[PDB]
Amino acid sequence: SAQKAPKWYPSEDVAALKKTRKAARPQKLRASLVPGTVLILLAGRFRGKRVVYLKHLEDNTLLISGPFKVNGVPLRRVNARYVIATSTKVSVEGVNVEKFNVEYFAKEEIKAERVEDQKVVDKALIAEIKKTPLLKQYLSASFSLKNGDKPHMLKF
Amino acid sequence: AEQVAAERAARKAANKEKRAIILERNAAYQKEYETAERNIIQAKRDAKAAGSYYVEAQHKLVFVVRIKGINKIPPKPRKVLQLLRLTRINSGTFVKVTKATLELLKLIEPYVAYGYPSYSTIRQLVYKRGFGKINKQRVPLSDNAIIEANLGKYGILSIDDLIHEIITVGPHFKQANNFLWPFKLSNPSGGWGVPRKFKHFIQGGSFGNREEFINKLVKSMN
Amino acid sequence: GIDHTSKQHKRSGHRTAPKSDNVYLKLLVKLYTFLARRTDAPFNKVVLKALFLSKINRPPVSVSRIARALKQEGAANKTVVVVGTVTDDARIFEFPKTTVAALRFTAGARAKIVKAGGECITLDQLAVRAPKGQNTLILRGPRNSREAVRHFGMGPHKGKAPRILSTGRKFERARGRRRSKGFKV
Amino acid sequence: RVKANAAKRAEAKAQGVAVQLKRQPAQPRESRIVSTEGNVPQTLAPVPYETFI
Amino acid sequence: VLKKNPLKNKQVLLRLNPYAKVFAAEKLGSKKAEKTGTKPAAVFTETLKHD
Amino acid sequence: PSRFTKTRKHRGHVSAGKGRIGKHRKHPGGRGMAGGQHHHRINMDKYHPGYFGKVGMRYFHKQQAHFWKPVLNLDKLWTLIPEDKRDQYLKSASKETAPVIDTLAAGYGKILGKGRIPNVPVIVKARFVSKLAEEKIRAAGGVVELIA
RNA sequence: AAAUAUGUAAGAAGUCCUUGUUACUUAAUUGAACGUGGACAUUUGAAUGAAGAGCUUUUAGUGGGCCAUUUUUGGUAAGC
RNA sequence: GGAAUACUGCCAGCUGGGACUGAGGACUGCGACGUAAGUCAAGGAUGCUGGCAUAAUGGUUAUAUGCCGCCCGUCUUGAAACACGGACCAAGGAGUCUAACGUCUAUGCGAGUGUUUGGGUGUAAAACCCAUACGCGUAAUGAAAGUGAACGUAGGUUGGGGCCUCGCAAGAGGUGCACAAUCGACCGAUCCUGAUGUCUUCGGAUGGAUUUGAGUAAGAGCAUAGCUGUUGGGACCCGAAAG
RNA sequence: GAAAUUGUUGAAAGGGAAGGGCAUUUGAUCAGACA
Numbered sequence A: 001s002a003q004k005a006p007k008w009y010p011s012e013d014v015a016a017l018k019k020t021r022k023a024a025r026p027q028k029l030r031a032s033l034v035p036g037t038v039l040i041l042l043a044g045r046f047r048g049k050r051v052v053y054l055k056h057l058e059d060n061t062l063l064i065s066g067p068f069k070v071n072g073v074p075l076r077r078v079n080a081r082y083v084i085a086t087s088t089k090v091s092v093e094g095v096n097v098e099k100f101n102v103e104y105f106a107k108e109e110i111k112a113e114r115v116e117d118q119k120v121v122d123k124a125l126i127a128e129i130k131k132t133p134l135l136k137q138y139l140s141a142s143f144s145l146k147n148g149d150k151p152h153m154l155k156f
Numbered sequence B: 001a002e003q004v005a006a007e008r009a010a011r012k013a014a015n016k017e018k019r020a021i022i023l024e025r026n027a028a029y030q031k032e033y034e035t036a037e038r039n040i041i042q043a044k045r046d047a048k049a050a051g052s053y054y055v056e057a058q059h060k061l062v063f064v065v066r067i068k069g070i071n072k073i074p075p076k077p078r079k080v081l082q083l084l085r086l087t088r089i090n091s092g093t094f095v096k097v098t099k100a101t102l103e104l105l106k107l108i109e110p111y112v113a114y115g116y117p118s119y120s121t122i123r124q125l126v127y128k129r130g131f132g133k134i135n136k137q138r139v140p141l142s143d144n145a146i147i148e149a150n151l152g153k154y155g156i157l158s159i160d161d162l163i164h165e166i167i168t169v170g171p172h173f174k175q176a177n178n179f180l181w182p183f184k185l186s187n188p189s190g191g192w193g194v195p196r197k198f199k200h201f202i203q204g205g206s207f208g209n210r211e212e213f214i215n216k217l218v219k220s221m222n
Numbered sequence C: 001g002i003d004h005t006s007k008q009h010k011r012s013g014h015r016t017a018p019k020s021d022n023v024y025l026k027l028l029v030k031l032y033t034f035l036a037r038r039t040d041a042p043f044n045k046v047v048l049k050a051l052f053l054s055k056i057n058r059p060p061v062s063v064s065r066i067a068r069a070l071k072q073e074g075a076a077n078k079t080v081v082v083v084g085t086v087t088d089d090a091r092i093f094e095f096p097k098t099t100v101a102a103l104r105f106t107a108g109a110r111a112k113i114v115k116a117g118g119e120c121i122t123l124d125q126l127a128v129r130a131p132k133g134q135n136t137l138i139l140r141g142p143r144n145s146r147e148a149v150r151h152f153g154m155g156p157h158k159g160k161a162p163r164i165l166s167t168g169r170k171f172e173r174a175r176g177r178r179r180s181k182g183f184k185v
Numbered sequence D: 001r002v003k004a005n006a007a008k009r010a011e012a013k014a015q016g017v018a019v020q021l022k023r024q025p026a027q028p029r030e031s032r033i034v035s036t037e038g039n040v041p042q043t044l045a046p047v048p049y050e051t052f053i
Numbered sequence E: 001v002l003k004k005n006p007l008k009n010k011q012v013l014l015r016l017n018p019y020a021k022v023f024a025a026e027k028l029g030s031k032k033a034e035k036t037g038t039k040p041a042a043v044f045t046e047t048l049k050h051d
Numbered sequence F: 001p002s003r004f005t006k007t008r009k010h011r012g013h014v015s016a017g018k019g020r021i022g023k024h025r026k027h028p029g030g031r032g033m034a035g036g037q038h039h040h041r042i043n044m045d046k047y048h049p050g051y052f053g054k055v056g057m058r059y060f061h062k063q064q065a066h067f068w069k070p071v072l073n074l075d076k077l078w079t080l081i082p083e084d085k086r087d088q089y090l091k092s093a094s095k096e097t098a099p100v101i102d103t104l105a106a107g108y109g110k111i112l113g114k115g116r117i118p119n120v121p122v123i124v125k126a127r128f129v130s131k132l133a134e135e136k137i138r139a140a141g142g143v144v145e146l147i148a
Numbered sequence G: 001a002a003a004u005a006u007g008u009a010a011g012a013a014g015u016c017c018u019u020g021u022u023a024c025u026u027a028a029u030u031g032a033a034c035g036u037g038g039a040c041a042u043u044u045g046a047a048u049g050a051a052g053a054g055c056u057u058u059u060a061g062u063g064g065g066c067c068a069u070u071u072u073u074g075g076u077a078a079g080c
Numbered sequence H: 001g002g003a004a005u006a007c008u009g010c011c012a013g014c015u016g017g018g019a020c021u022g023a024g025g026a027c028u029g030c031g032a033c034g035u036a037a038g039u040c041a042a043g044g045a046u047g048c049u050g051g052c053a054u055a056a057u058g059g060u061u062a063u064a065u066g067c068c069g070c071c072c073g074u075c076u077u078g079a080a081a082c083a084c085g086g087a088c089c090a091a092g093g094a095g096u097c098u099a100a101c102g103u104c105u106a107u108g109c110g111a112g113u114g115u116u117u118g119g120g121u122g123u124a125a126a127a128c129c130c131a132u133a134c135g136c137g138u139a140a141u142g143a144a145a146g147u148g149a150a151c152g153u154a155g156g157u158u159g160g161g162g163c164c165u166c167g168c169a170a171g172a173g174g175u176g177c178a179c180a181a182u183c184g185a186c187c188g189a190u191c192c193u194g195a196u197g198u199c200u201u202c203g204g205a206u207g208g209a210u211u212u213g214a215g216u217a218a219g220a221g222c223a224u225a226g227c228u229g230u231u232g233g234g235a236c237c238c239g240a241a242a243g
Numbered sequence I: 001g002a003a004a005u006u007g008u009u010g011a012a013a014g015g016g017a018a019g020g021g022c023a024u025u026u027g028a029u030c031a032g033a034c035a
């Protein structure tokens, strides 16, 4: 031989895992995140876009809407840590939302159902936005840090 | 073949018996400590009332932390640091105060800080960095059965028993206190409060008896 | 750093195995370490360690020294154990019965023992008859009889035998050895 | 001290033990109350420097 | 295999020392003391404020 | 074999285990047994008291042989009888038929008396005896017969 | 006449009772030395510590030293 | 008069932001929460989602940039030294063998041990076999002539592992090898004593002594081999002026 | 048919030496593992 055989080999038997104790418990959101609250998206495709928050989804994400007809953002998932919660606020009591969950956004262009859903949720919101002057205009402009803005000082 | 639970019976039950004894025992100490504290408070007040002066008993127990490294140390203080079990910087141990140990403390003032520990800091020393010596082998406390297996002989069958033995400097302070490994502390988190450690506490330095100010140090180091 | 107070990394200083390379010896050791771990019998711990011993620390026990021991009060029926070799001794004329267990019996020792209707036994036959070493009498031979130790501790007034090759008058017996030749030792 | 020990050993024992006859070091002081009666505290200060010579 | 600080880890807090449960339960860490009012002798005061 | 030898282990270190200061030089002590009475005296006295000077008488042309005279103690003595033959004599401690032992034939010169023979007659032929050996021999009912 | 240094002691190899041995020793069965028999146990005789203690053999290198605080000699002094 | 606050201390009061780590691999423990079923943050990380599946991450390498980095070897108290060797590279280049030894260890056999000068024999410098001696050991001590190791269970005392007996156990007693300490006895030397006796000067019993020995006191050796150490040898390698 | 040392070719750096350490950028190069 070129090399002597080893005298002992490892077993090829793979152990099982120890019985880990790590309960998945529900994520409670920072108190600033109540539905109706306008969010500033900090990252991603719609970064800088100001948007309305609708529902906390079962995968911890946030359901938001532009409204699409205001600024072009659809019903969409958004990650709660990439969001600045502002202090301005629309009532969201005429918006259904029961429908929407994780599977609704399963990967599986745009299905008519989605397009229709957007109209049903947005006409409700739009009704509400119009109640406070300039809110719609506010909702169309992107957020942007200006020279000498200090996020650790600014109130949102 | 029973045993399955049929000797888990005896065991589970008997363990419950023991926590019971520990509960009644810990509730006892709590009373003991409160009325001790209050009596001296009312001692001091009664005396003022009477136009007099209540001088507390002298402290029976100190806690010593080595503050100096391992180099350039003269032989007499050196042997004493060893006998007190302080062979590395920031380690610490308890010392019951008598003339025959007082003079040891005297001989090592340049290299240690010490003072009179309160219940809170003895409690938190043991809860967090308290290890027994067991066939040597420095073993973490973490469960009461460890204590009772090794000190049960002297009464003392829980962690808070251990503490009660230390703080009252009970009849078995030698065995109890030797049982604890030297506490291994970190550097103070606040810092030392002084520009230079190696002067006495009294001269704006760090060593010597600093009496009750030992607790702030130790906590910042624990 | 640590103000150490004893050498670090210090070996205990006791053999742990024998230094011998002998299968059978190593097997007897397999036997007795098992016996030592799984019985609380002190006998087995002692025997374990003796097997580790080197030749010096295993002087031979003689059959006459064996006989002497059996003369102990309440001891004639004890089975004697020698962890080493057992030599013969024409100097005794009447040797008793008993059972000796040892590592080695010389031709003549075995004879003497067996001719008195005794029994020579190996340490493992010993193990099966007496797992807690019940009823046993462990004998060791004389260690400090060895020719070597005649010269340990050589020095003035110690009285202890020169390392010398030829001997006689005229070999290290003058100046320093007698009052009239400088001095004495 | 040996003779003494033997005494209070037998001496006690006969009563019904409870001895303690190892020597013990100077203990620290226990509490105590000091009165002021006939003994109000005298106040001293440090004193100025001076020569006398 | 991993030392857990009773001081933070209620679980092992309560494993060692079962009194902890009631200590907390009864607050005890904030015991109100009996409000008595003894007053110090003028002697005590006089000499506190002396020179 | 060189294989196991410390000089294999010293390759690569400068001084070969012999020191940077003290070095390995040719003959610092001097050669051989030099210095005996001078710089090597502490080791000679101690370890070798007796070395220098003389004692007793010179003997020119001493023929070792003249003094050939091995000792055998009663200690043994019975060993000079072959064991099969031996057991037979022990049993029948007896005049009229006691064993003859030619110790000279066995190659001994003197019989000495180390310790206790059985209480059995022996006839012991030897060149010399210690007073004691003869005594013990006789107390077993035996005799020494002086040969040459 | 200090301070710092330094000898010994803090028991089971201990203490107490009874009374054997000798050629030593006493006026003396007096002593002295060594003992037999009996009585008392881990608060059995201060503290602190002890990753144990004791012991034996054999052999290397070394046998230019230098420095700091304090004590300190010579020297005016010196990185003497 | 009646409060508040500061300061110091305590809580097994609650709670937010941030960093590093996730060792282990069925179960087994100590617990906690529940009326319970069951649950858990209780003897070491899992759940959910995405992107890439390639030089992307990672290795190697050159370069650049931050900070760091004096020439090795040597003797020396102290070397980067304004101390010495060394321009460069290959190849060679220094504790060996032998006689005789000390300690230790392994192995054979053991009061013995050592076949190898020789002989026998052979598949021929091998392997196998062997008689007589000899060497070391089993006796010491004296300059020598010489003498030559049991009062005694081969002794007493103290400690001793182990074993034995009692006890559920803790303990108590019995025996006690090795080893250690101590007091004795035995052999030789030296000194004293000097019985029974005698080719009247030989003989030297017996009992002793702050003397003395590398001794006895139920043997431990002999041989082969190894590391280390010792002496003689060119003697770790290289070097005189000389004779 | 090694090395010292040399010619050419290719690539790179170079404000009074060069070489080295920890680290990363950049360039060049390459292993593995995936299904």
Ligand SMILES: [Mg+2]
Residues within 6 Å of the ligand: A020, A021, A022, A023
């Ligand atoms: Mg779980």
Ligand SMILES: [Mg+2]
Residues within 6 Å of the ligand: A026, A027, A028, A029
């Ligand atoms: Mg939450």
Ligand SMILES: [Mg+2]
Residues within 6 Å of the ligand: A070, A071, A072, A140
């Ligand atoms: Mg728009």
Ligand SMILES: [Mg+2]
Residues within 6 Å of the ligand: none
């Ligand atoms: Mg200093």
Ligand SMILES: [Mg+2]
Residues within 6 Å of the ligand: B083, B084, B085, B093, B094, B095, B177
């Ligand atoms: Mg301590």
Ligand SMILES: [Mg+2]
Residues within 6 Å of the ligand: B189, B190
């Ligand atoms: Mg802090």
Ligand SMILES: [Mg+2]
Residues within 6 Å of the ligand: none
């Ligand atoms: Mg800080």
Ligand SMILES: [Mg+2]
Residues within 6 Å of the ligand: none
């Ligand atoms: Mg702070």
Ligand SMILES: [Mg+2]
Residues within 6 Å of the ligand: B195, B196
């Ligand atoms: Mg400063």
Ligand SMILES: [Mg+2]
Residues within 6 Å of the ligand: B186, B189, B220, B221, B222
């Ligand atoms: Mg800390």
Ligand SMILES: [Mg+2]
Residues within 6 Å of the ligand: none
């Ligand atoms: Mg001998």
Ligand SMILES: [Mg+2]
Residues within 6 Å of the ligand: none
């Ligand atoms: Mg000899």
Ligand SMILES: [Mg+2]
Residues within 6 Å of the ligand: none
């Ligand atoms: Mg050799």
Ligand SMILES: [Mg+2]
Residues within 6 Å of the ligand: F001, F002, F003, F004
């Ligand atoms: Mg070799």
Ligand SMILES: [Mg+2]
Residues within 6 Å of the ligand: F003, F004, F008
């Ligand atoms: Mg090698």
Ligand SMILES: [Mg+2]
Residues within 6 Å of the ligand: F009, F010
């Ligand atoms: Mg080496």
